[PDB]
Amino acid sequence: ENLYFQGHMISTLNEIMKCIEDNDTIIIHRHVRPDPDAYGSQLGLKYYIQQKFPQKQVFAVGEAESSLSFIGELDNIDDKTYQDALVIVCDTANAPRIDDERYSTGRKLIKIDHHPAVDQYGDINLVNTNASSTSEIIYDLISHFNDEAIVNKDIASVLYLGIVGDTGRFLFNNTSEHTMEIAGKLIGHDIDHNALLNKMMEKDPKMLPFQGYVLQHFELMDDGFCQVKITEDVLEQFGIQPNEASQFVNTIADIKGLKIWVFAVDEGNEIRCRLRSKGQLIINDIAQDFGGGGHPNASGVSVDSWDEFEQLATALRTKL
Amino acid sequence: SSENLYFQGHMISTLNEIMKCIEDNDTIIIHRHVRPDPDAYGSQLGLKYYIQQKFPQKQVFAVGEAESSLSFIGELDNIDDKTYQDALVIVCDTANAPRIDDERYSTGRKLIKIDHHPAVDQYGDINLVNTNASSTSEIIYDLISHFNDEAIVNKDIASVLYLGIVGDTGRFLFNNTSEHTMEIAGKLIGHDIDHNALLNKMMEKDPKMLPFQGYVLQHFELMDDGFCQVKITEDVLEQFGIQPNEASQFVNTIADIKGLKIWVFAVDEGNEIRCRLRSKGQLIINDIAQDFGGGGHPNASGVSVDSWDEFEQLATALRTKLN
Ligand SMILES: [Mg+2]
Ligand SMILES: [Mg+2]
Ligand SMILES: [Mg+2]
Ligand SMILES: [Mg+2]
Fold this sequence. Notes:
The structure is a homodimer.
Chain A: H1 3-21, E1 25-29, H2 36-52, E2 57-60, E3 86-90, E4 108-113, E5 124-127, H3 134-144, H4 153-167, H5 177-187, H6 193-201, H7 208-216, E6 219-220, E7 225-230, H8 232-238, H9 242-246, E8 260-266, E9 271-277, H10 284-289, E10 293-295, E11 298-303, H11 306-318
Parallel strand pairs in A: 1-2, 1-3, 3-4, 4-5, 7-8
Antiparallel strand pairs in A: 6-7, 8-9, 9-11, 10-11
Helix pairs in contact in A: 2-3, 2-4, 3-4, 4-5
The complex binds magnesium ion (4 copies).
């Protein structure tokens, strides 16, 4: 938290708003396979700009996810809308993982994210790994410009869901005192947080038999390591898609004596692995060692065979 | 809000009388309710540690039967009956006097009640009740704040109070979570408690029960009208090496399914099939349960049937409420 980082944060914040002020059309993108924080940061920024600058044309684009559609509706726009437009990307550490490839077809590109800065693809890169979520960064932006009063029910609701998504509702280690203070203020806007959380947690009945496979086929070792391996034949047995299977990475997290676990889904020509750890244990390092990365307690790796998975395992078990 | 400020003013006099009693007594003993929850532990130990930190020379004790699931929160004190002579007794989180754990609570010279449940039984000499608080732990924090002692809070105080707030809010999920609740929990996290570690310890589950939850997830039957049934045969209990009572704690495993309105979780113990009946919103199912020889509350009832053929009639009866 050096004094220089802080000064650069203020300047970056100020620069972003000038880019917003100087642009009539603002288009906001997020990552493929969106989560609540993706939807909440994108839409929250959209609604914030729309409230502060009611003449500007602000759009939120990408492929909609039916599980998240309750958060808000996305915009379908023409390729011409991008001409001399400001493009902002939320929540996306790597440019290949952005959901619409037109993010580069504009005059300016801004990145706002809370993942370690490894791909500085913006002309402006706002990165704060000390934030719980990109949603929380968006509220920090609002607070910087003393606009906390323009926050209405819509902004507060989508930003609240985004913080909740990335903290597991204030559970994970990325929840700070600042995180709780923001979420308190958001609830202050009468958003009926219980109703929102109930909607977000509601389950598609057709996915539950697969979740039961996880509960019955997890492998916990006395070491504190656990593994769940989903083969291509399993996804076929249950009629589910690999992104759908990935949403069950934390199904086993409450097991007594759990320390490190990996959730591996063979997506065909690539096994997507979600690496998770308890406490101050570190897995982000082993993730980078295999071409992956993310948070030290929540990172992702892809391998190309089950023999290479076993190496991801062995390496992870050395960390105790 | 204006209304909230008025509510805080009504309690100020009570807060100051509790503290005077605390100051006036060198021995202070704190009780909570039988079958304790996180909030019961956290409010009792929170207040104990607060008094111990503000008055290091007083003798402050937290009594009651320990619960193995919650003992990580803090250890309870074991005292002889004579310790209550001319002592101050405080009871936290306990609406009704028959539910105070240790009966020695009346053996002292003063009784104080601190609680957040509806004031139906004002069993204390002094009674502090705030139904607008999320939890008794949140009331304890408000007391600390009223006497400008927020800096006296240490890791012990913040940890136990945080767990008590988390317990009665479902970790900031229920409607009793206010903005003020969130703000307090923030301040508590600011005392460098390891909240994820504390929570992990609280949510800790037995790996043996996970397989059976999976069966439940692979053998529920949702109908288009929103009715859902889980039928557990006695052979299944044997397969997963579980007991009928254990198996009944999975009644709400499917409660988050989209479209769900009424469900029944039915377990075949050799003698009878024990059915747990549940409903969403304003749907009533306890009239149906009464019709088949059981009963309970409108949204949560139980009935025993003697055959799966009787189960089907119970089911058919339940669905008449969905039409
Ligand atoms: Mg995120
Ligand atoms: Mg995300
Ligand atoms: Mg309570
Ligand atoms: Mg209680």
